Amino acid sequence: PRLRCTEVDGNGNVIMVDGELKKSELIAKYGLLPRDLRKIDSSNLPHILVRPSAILINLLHLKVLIKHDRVLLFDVYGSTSSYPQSAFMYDLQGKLQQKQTGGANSLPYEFRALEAVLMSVTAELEADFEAVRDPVIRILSELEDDIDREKLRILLVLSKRVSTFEQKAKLVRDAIEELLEADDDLAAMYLTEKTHDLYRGEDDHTEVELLLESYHKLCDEVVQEASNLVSSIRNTEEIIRAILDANRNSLMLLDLKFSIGTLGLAMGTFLAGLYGMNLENFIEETNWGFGAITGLSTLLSLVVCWYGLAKLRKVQR
Amino acid sequence: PRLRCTEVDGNGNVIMVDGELKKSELIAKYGLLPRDLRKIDSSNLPHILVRPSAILINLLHLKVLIKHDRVLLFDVYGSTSSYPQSAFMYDLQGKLQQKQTGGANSLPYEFRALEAVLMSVTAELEADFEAVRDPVIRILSELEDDIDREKLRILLVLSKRVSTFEQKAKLVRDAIEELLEADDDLAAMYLTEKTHDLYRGEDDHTEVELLLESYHKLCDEVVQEASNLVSSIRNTEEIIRAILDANRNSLMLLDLKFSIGTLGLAMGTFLAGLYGMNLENFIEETNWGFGAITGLSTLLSLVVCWYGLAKLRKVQR
Amino acid sequence: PRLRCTEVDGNGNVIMVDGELKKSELIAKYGLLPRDLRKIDSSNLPHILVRPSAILINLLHLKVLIKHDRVLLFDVYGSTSSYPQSAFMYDLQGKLQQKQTGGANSLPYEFRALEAVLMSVTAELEADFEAVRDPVIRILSELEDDIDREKLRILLVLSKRVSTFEQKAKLVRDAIEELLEADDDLAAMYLTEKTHDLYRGEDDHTEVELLLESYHKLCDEVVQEASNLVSSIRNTEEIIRAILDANRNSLMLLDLKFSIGTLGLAMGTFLAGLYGMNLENFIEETNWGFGAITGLSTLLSLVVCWYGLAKLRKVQR
Amino acid sequence: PRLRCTEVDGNGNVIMVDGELKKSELIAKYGLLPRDLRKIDSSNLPHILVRPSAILINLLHLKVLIKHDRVLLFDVYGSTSSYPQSAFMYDLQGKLQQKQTGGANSLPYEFRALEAVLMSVTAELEADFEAVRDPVIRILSELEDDIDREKLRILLVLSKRVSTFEQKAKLVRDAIEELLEADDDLAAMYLTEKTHDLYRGEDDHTEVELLLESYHKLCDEVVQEASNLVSSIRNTEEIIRAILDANRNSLMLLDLKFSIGTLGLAMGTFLAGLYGMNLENFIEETNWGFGAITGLSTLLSLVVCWYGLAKLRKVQR
Amino acid sequence: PRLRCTEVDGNGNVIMVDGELKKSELIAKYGLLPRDLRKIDSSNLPHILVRPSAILINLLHLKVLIKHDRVLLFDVYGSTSSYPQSAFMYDLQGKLQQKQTGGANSLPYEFRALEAVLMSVTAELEADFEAVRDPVIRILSELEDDIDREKLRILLVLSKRVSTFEQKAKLVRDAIEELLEADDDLAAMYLTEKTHDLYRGEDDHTEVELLLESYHKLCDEVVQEASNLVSSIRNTEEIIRAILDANRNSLMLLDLKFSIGTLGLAMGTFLAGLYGMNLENFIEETNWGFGAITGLSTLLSLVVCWYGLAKLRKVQR
Ligand SMILES: [Mg+2]
Ligand SMILES: [Mg+2]
Ligand SMILES: [Mg+2]
Ligand SMILES: [Mg+2]
Ligand SMILES: [Mg+2]
Ligand SMILES: [Mg+2]
Ligand SMILES: [Mg+2]
Ligand SMILES: [Mg+2]
Ligand SMILES: [Mg+2]
Ligand SMILES: [Mg+2]
Ligand SMILES: [Mg+2]
Ligand SMILES: [Mg+2]
Ligand SMILES: [Mg+2]
Ligand SMILES: [Mg+2]
Ligand SMILES: [Mg+2]
Ligand SMILES: [Mg+2]
Ligand SMILES: [Mg+2]
Ligand SMILES: [Mg+2]
Ligand SMILES: [Mg+2]
Ligand SMILES: [Mg+2]
Ligand SMILES: [Mg+2]
Ligand SMILES: [Mg+2]
Ligand SMILES: [Mg+2]
Ligand SMILES: [Mg+2]
């Protein structure tokens, strides 16, 4: 029933750092509906909701409520502001307290807040992609030559992480594109003009459209890069899978030569041991039996080995 | 020709728990068509049908007919109300008998019933996902290190279940989105106003659209989670498939050393048994033949083993 | 140039069972075009064509021409009516000869014929799915435990059949959806009103739309069931493919123990046969050489076997 | 700068067979643009372009320019008319020189030319599919039982050809559908009426739409057939891939029995050769040592073989 | 804060080759927005942006700003103009300084610049495809017969390159199609007319649409060619993967014959060595024991080899 909240007024000055806010006041004086509170509490789906007097943004690490005179950043009650959140808060305060008075390119409060939010989200996405891209190239280069046991596990660890990052980037891009495809939602975001009884209409929304298209393309570029990386990983895996079976056949063929050699040696040993029996061979007292038998055994071994090698060469041809 | 029916009147009071209803009365006094009855009897396709005076909802475990003054929950004649059905009935009764009189955020009878129906469906989907997600992480962690025989069967059992749950969630999300994409269907659901000769029109349907979008996003989140889980399972399977062939080559290479050792031993044994024949060797009575022959056999075995090992190292290089 | 035709007049009475019809009369007095005849002769693509005074339906086993006062069922000249065709004809005759006069839910001749056609097509699709689904579960259950040679062939026979049935169901669903997406085609199917100089218009087509949506959903359900079955088959195949390689490694590892045993036996036999040569061993007349040599050979065999087993355990670790 | 051209005037009479035409006259007196000439020279992408006074068709083997009073068929300067081109020219001449005067179903010059072009393209596509379909069934039937070396190469040759034909058919179907999806392009093809200061408008294009839909469906049917064939090929490949590993395990298991037999024989031979040493065995002069030792060796061989077989049966269980 | 810039005035004369330009002047006097500068600095996503008074093009190697009287080509500050950039600049200068005065087919300054830009991009894409296509056919032809170790690595190197080129071509085609799908963007590109207080409107954009469609189709053709090449590579890989396992079984079966031969030789050697023991055989002094024992051993070896071969033939059947 409580949330940690940081509040900024219309002058860009922080009046609350890590205060506690009851979700009842959100319905009371912020134009929200009772059914939207459960989206604020716990939701990992990036989205942008346009209300008659407020804008709700849930993008990765940012949960923001933007009005024409106030900005709220909320999160779980028990927590502390992270470094990206502090950097975003500093940038938003600096951009809001500019108090500039330009000409044609002047932007209101809510658009200046949305621009900072989108820039922070895009910067975080780019940083995450740069942090995740580095090990993949190294492990692919290491797997180019040899295939070990632990490198496959490293590739397994990296592939799912890359796929999850690509899915998150696609979700953010689709969340932006969904808002980019509604004319009434684009027209209803002019909160400053609605406070002066001025309504824009569903056909004059150039500024917000131009603001959103740039970040849409920025997210699309990272999505394409992640898709290319995934395709490269898939190709490398599909090639090494066949490389394994290609290099196994070398050992499979090498074993047969040793098998043929053992067969020839056994064939020679059979005839060598035939004459070792305690029987009558009729040539025991001769002076030529030993050399003749040795030569016959050697010739038989050689011819059987040659026949085996010839048959192997014919088969493998 | 009979169905089990639970009835709630316009005051939120239950007047029938598990009564029997003939399908003829549905056509008689509920604004249904004769061809829709077969959808009520047996259908596993989630859908929402908008009639001039009634709304038909078939979502998983809920078969509901909603009017401006009555609510019916129907199912097969021979059955009993389940725990989710009883919880949904209790929640619907509690929300209907509130008798609240709000301001701008007041909702009619049919919208209050539809909100409870959608909340029950989303809660059941979330519970099913939480129940199905747990074993997958454990079996993936167990398969990270070693690959057994039964763990693959467990993964087979879990994968099809996860895919079926993802398909069911996608079907529910698409059923909601189909209703979200029709302006006339959205405009025709204002049943309370049509009883006072007041018609809304195809351009003023803000309340029902805002009601439906939240549950659409709630279903989309679970769909994305299931898709991520399926992708992780696929990556793990594709990696272990190559891990098997990677670890087989170690034994394939280890066998060749034993083969070379056996070949060397056979080569030595051939010469050892050559001198065991009952023939004339001319060095039987000498005092140096035994050691010389033993040394020659040992040297031949050693050199053939060394040549085999060198050839194996050259091949595997 | 001839077709087998069955004709039903406006009163639901059959006047021709298996007559012969020349395709020229179709252009002469049925409002067809010369280029459509080739679709009637031989075409396996389900479609529905709307003409200014006729409707042409080609759905699986039905080739029907529907007018406001006549119904034709045509097929190849040399053939006989099948059992599904006879059942469809009986149902159509029974529904047409009802001569009922209802109130708000009264339907004209062409709509009553189209409803029967769609019901017959959906019933045949459901029967085909029920006939094709049964063997798949049994063969998957049989393949859950053991993988034989003929069961894989049975799975091969069943998979292509299931895929073809799913493709046919998707084609029928898309053929229905194509007609459901044209306002002018929906408006031009009111053939009865066009005979009284009454034209409906592209914005009042509630009856035919409601009639078609039910059968569209009926086909979609069978499509989803077939898709689920295909996914289950794919998962089972992808799991058994890895099960094979998982169970091969057991025999691959078991062979090495026998190899080590043979190596140890050969090592022992070498020393056993070294002392069998007809040379001077200097310990032939002693009373301790035999036992000493036997013990040395046994110890050498045991230690080499132990070293081989230890190396195998270290490698497989 | 030159093309081979065949010209037909408005009366259906050929005045040029294989003449030479400079591409400058196409811009001069045919309503083409300078940037379109490069599409006429060399392009393998089927397309239909609608000009204010001409129609350009590039479909497979046909490069045609159609006007309200003239038809041109062009190709590379150095070439000769093929048999399909000659058949198309004969059919077009025969259809143009009919000089028929019908009633409601009368078609102008350009529509009569387009109908012949589309019929020729569809006939050629059907002939190509019929020529490519035949060997696939035979090779699949041959691979159903046994898997050889050359049959896999034949399947490799056929699969890419089938995929390329399917891609070409899909490209033709998409080229037709692109023209079918533009109202202004459909309205601008009434070249005959534009010569009498009569303009049709983007809402009256029934004739050309009905003409194009038939050939669109004709191409879609062949696309579906090719897709079914590709799916069957994929299923057959995925099944034989597992059949190979299924039948390898039989030989893998059969080798172990021979290994156990060799181990038992070696175990027996070790004890047989232990008593062959030239040492003192103390039972040389007895009349029972020979049979006892033979029986002991045989029993040891039998028991070790039995233990090996039992262990193998336990492992394979 | 600086970029390398080449400038061309309205007469087609170059006044700056490799000058330095500060990005502030782009906002000052070129109609750009402060948020677009980061797209000019570093972006690999091809896009076309339409401004009220300028057009920004980022296509591969071209970063161009087009106005009604000036053309800028910009890139990183530290760099030099490449050969494609110089060729594009020469072609653009030649086309701009034509000073032609045509009739109906006259084009303004910005359209003449855009045509040259698109022609250069298409020519570079075609050249890249022609350079990348050649090695693939050769390596596929080499892999058709035999499968080596390095050829698989070459295929791995080529496959990812082909996929990346296909992705780049698809990105360029989609970038063109995105501009082709906006009526307001097409209408706002008439910069010359807007300088004379003449506005076109969202319904008269024939010239630019016809200009863009040709290059859209040109890119689509290369996309289709790349897709066909990728499909061929995938089919070849999937076939050689099974070819490997098909040819392994030949050696697997050949090893068993040698195993059976060794088993038979061992069986014969066992009986040959049984009679070599120093025991009483009772047939030592006979004149028939030697031949009888030799024949018995040979017959036993032959019968066991025959039984093994018969069992192998029965198993492999
Ligand atoms: Mg993952
Ligand atoms: Mg807009
Ligand atoms: Mg825009
Ligand atoms: Mg890629
Ligand atoms: Mg021996
Ligand atoms: Mg499943
Ligand atoms: Mg709306
Ligand atoms: Mg909305
Ligand atoms: Mg994912
Ligand atoms: Mg051996
Ligand atoms: Mg199939
Ligand atoms: Mg409608
Ligand atoms: Mg509807
Ligand atoms: Mg499924
Ligand atoms: Mg191919
Ligand atoms: Mg139309
Ligand atoms: Mg139509
Ligand atoms: Mg299929
Ligand atoms: Mg001896
Ligand atoms: Mg002796
Ligand atoms: Mg790649
Ligand atoms: Mg247009
Ligand atoms: Mg156009
Ligand atoms: Mg292809």
Author numbering:
A (entry chain C), B (entry chain B), C (entry chain A), D (entry chain E), E (entry chain D): 166 to 482
What does the paper behind this entry write?
The CorA/Mrs2 family of pentameric proteins are cardinal for the influx of Mg2+ across cellular membranes, importing the cation to mitochondria in eukaryotes. The mitochondrial inner membrane protein Mrs2 (mitochondrial RNA-splicing protein 2) is responsible for regulating the Mg2+ concentrations of mitochondria in eukaryotes, providing controlled uptake of the ion14–16. CorA/Mrs2 forms homopentamers with two transmembrane (TM) helices (TM1 and TM2) in each monomer, which are preceded by a soluble N-terminal domain (NTD) that regulates the Mg2+ passage. The protein family exposes only the loop between TM1 and TM2 to the surrounding environment but this stretch harbors a conserved selective filter GMN motif that is essential for permeation.
We first maintained Mg2+ in all procedures during sample preparation. The final reconstructed map reached an average resolution of 3.1 Å in the absence of imposed symmetry. Finally, two additional features of the cryo-EM density in the pore are assigned as Mg2+ ions, the first located at T434 (glycine in hMrs2) and the second positioned at the conserved T427. Three more constriction regions of the pore follow P2, marked by D420 (asparagine in hMrs2), the conserved M417–R413 pair that is positioned at the membrane interface to the matrix and the R406 (phenylalanine in hMrs2)–D410 (invariant) pair. Nonetheless, the combination of invariant positively charged residues at R413 and a hydrophobic or positively charged lock for cations at R406, along with the small diameters at these constrictions (4.0 and 2.0 Å, respectively, representing the narrowest parts of the permeation pathway), indicates that the CtMrs2 structure is closed. The cryo-EM density reveals the presence of four more putative Mg2+-binding sites per monomer, present as a ‘glue’ in between separate polypeptides in the soluble fraction of CtMrs2. One pair of these sites (M1 and M2; M for the matrix of the mitochondria) are positioned at the tip of the protein. The second pair of putative Mg2+-binding sites (here denoted M3 and M4) are located in between the stalk helix of one monomer and helix α5 of the adjacent monomer. In the closed state, Mg2+ ions bind between the NTDs of separate monomers (positions M1 and M4 or M1–M4 in CtMrs2), thereby assisting in stabilizing the symmetrical shape, and to distinct positions of the pore (U, S, P1 and P2). At elevated Mg2+ concentrations in the matrix, Mrs2 is stabilized in a closed configuration through Mg2+ that bridges the monomers, two of which (sites M1 and M4) are conserved in Mrs2, including hMrs2.
